[PDB]
Nucleic acid binder design. Structure first.
Lengths: 139, 353
RNA sequence: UUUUUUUUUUUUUUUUUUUUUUUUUUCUCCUCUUUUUUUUUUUU
């Protein structure tokens, strides 16, 4: 089933000590996509909050459009939003706890069309870094 | 030396008893041997007696600099010890595979439960903070060392009283019991150990076993669980192979027993505080039974210190004065001098060449 | 009117040891509104 991979990290402690901690990562075949046009119900069974198809389109900020412009995306007229987990992780590890709590209340709410996607736990959407890079471009 | 061996008649008799559900000293299955606490005079010192076991607890604090990292807490030593006098076998460096499991049980219980409040033991950060240091000794071994050691550590920590300090601006000051009153500690909960013994492959169990019953058993189960209903450590050990209903039964039993033990401890500490506050006499001395053949008491006595001057004077006067042959020091060459019968020549030279 | 023979529970005991609580992370963070700030006085 799963496919092990690794992730190195460079944590800087308060005393000025950095370290190359290594950690894990487990991919999967079937990440639920929480959509009403998924061409196979059973494999994930969609056990959560589920959209209803009426919209014209679907808009996905890359990471920044939800980092700062978040205050826009609450209006109950906006419909058809899906968040890539990598943006959520960016905002969590970059914007403290207030913005993240607002985002997670947004998600945890049956009033809007917001869902979350496991970009990073799906087996062919994950990509490893390469020679010469940055968080923005990889992102 | 070693300890007396176990015969083959006592084993048969103990197992016939256990099969018949009757114990040596009369107490039924779910019982403890009754307890008896006694407090010293300076704070944080007690003597607990479970049955015929003795443990001595003594707490003591001291002010040090708090390592690097964890700049806003204090450290907490512990040191169990087994006294050569506890039993024949104990030997200062020949019983090194019981000390480890005992220190570990004690430390995991007391330090991982987070009942002592090591938050509020700072004065500055990066600077001097209090370093407490618990100390236990075993005096007489009669089985179940860890229940008694745990009750002892609990009472010793719940009877201590720190020094106390004034901190304002950037300036220190240290008081004393006459300048300022010693201060208590903050204790969240009361983690109290319980032990169970299993007999002939888990078919029977007996609560709180003594030393003969400890040599006719397969394995031991310990369940450390503070008041309310909250378990804090478990450690199966010995030779046992357990089921799943039994751990739960044991947890119930330990619940009951820790309830009763905490009742007792609270009552005893209360009585002790009442005695200390009324204004009566306390201490190890006024605890010795007087209704007993093996105790005797004697109040003070001036003996007669009327004669020592005369005796000393006559003794000094009545003995031979220092003599008066004075010796001479000889000088060979700056750096070395000799005193005594001396040597014939100035120094040796070409003695053999 | 049916003689004679077919061994049995391993030998051994008179070995030295000079340590010591723990142990190893988690980021920056919008404190709302009559004010200067009142003040003697006496009964505790």
């Amino acid at each position: 089933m799963l496919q092990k991979r690794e992730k190195v990290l460079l944590l800087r402690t308060f005393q000025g000590r950095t370290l190359r901690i290594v950690r894990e990562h487990y991919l999967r075949p079937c990440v639920p996509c929480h959509s009403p046009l998924c061409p196979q119900p059973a494999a994930c069974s969609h056990d959560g909050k589920l959209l209803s198809s009426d919209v014209t389109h679907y808009v996905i900020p890359d990471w920044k459009v939800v980092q700062d412009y978040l205050e826009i995306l609450e209006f109950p007229e906006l419909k058809g939003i899906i968040f890539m987990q990598t943006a959520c992780q960016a905002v969590q590890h970059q914007r403290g706890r207030r913005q993240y709590n607002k985002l997670r209340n947004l998600l945890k709410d049956a009033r809007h069309d917001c869902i979350l996607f496991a970009n990073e736990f799906q087996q062919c959407c994950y990509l490893p870094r390469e020679r010469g890079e940055s968080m923005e471009k990889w992102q | 030396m070693k300890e007396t061996p176990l015969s083959n008649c006592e084993r048969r008799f103990l197992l016939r008893a256990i099969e018949e559900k009757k114990r040596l000293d009369g107490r039924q299955t779910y019982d403890y041997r009754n307890i008896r606490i006694s407090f010293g005079t300076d704070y944080g010192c007690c003597i607990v007696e479970l049955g015929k076991t003795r443990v001595l607890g003594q707490v003591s604090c001291e002010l040090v600099s708090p390592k690097l990292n964890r700049a806003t807490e204090g450290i907490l030593f512990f040191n169990l010890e087994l006294s050569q006098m506890a039993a024949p076998a104990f030997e200062p460096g020949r019983q090194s595979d019981l000390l480890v499991k005992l220190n570990r049980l004690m430390e995991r219980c007391l330090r991982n439960s987070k009942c002592i409040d090591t938050e509020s033991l700072c004065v500055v950060a990066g600077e001097k903070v209090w370093q407490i240091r618990v100390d236990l000794h075993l005096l007489n071994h009669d089985g179940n060392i860890i229940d008694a050691a745990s009750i002892a550590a609990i009472v010793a920590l719940c009877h201590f009283r720190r020094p106390d300090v004034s901190v304002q601006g950037d300036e220190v000051t240290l008081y004393t019991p006459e300048e300022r009153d010693p201060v208590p500690l903050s204790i969240h909960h009361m983690p109290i150990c319980v032990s169970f013994a299993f007999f002939q492959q888990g078919t029977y169990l007996l609560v709180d076993p003594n030393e003969r019953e400890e040599r006719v058993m397969d394995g031991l189960l310990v369940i450390a669980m503070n008041k309310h209903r909250e378990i804090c450590t478990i450690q199966s050990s010995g030779g046992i192979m357990l089921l799943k209903d039994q751990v739960l039964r044991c947890s119930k039993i330990a619940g009951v027993k820790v309830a009763e033990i905490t009742e007792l401890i609270l009552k005893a500490l209360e009585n002790d505080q009442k005695v200390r506050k009324e204004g009566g006499k306390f201490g190890f001395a006024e605890s010795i039974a007087n209704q007993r053949i093996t105790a005797f008491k004697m109040e003070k006595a001036p003996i007669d210190t009327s004669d020592v001057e005369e005796k000393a004077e006559e003794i000094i006067a009545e003995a031979e004065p220092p003599s008066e042959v004075v010796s001479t020091p000889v000088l060979w060459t700056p750096g070395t001098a000799q005193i005594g019968e001396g040597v014939e020549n100035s120094w040796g030279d070409l003695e053999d060449s």
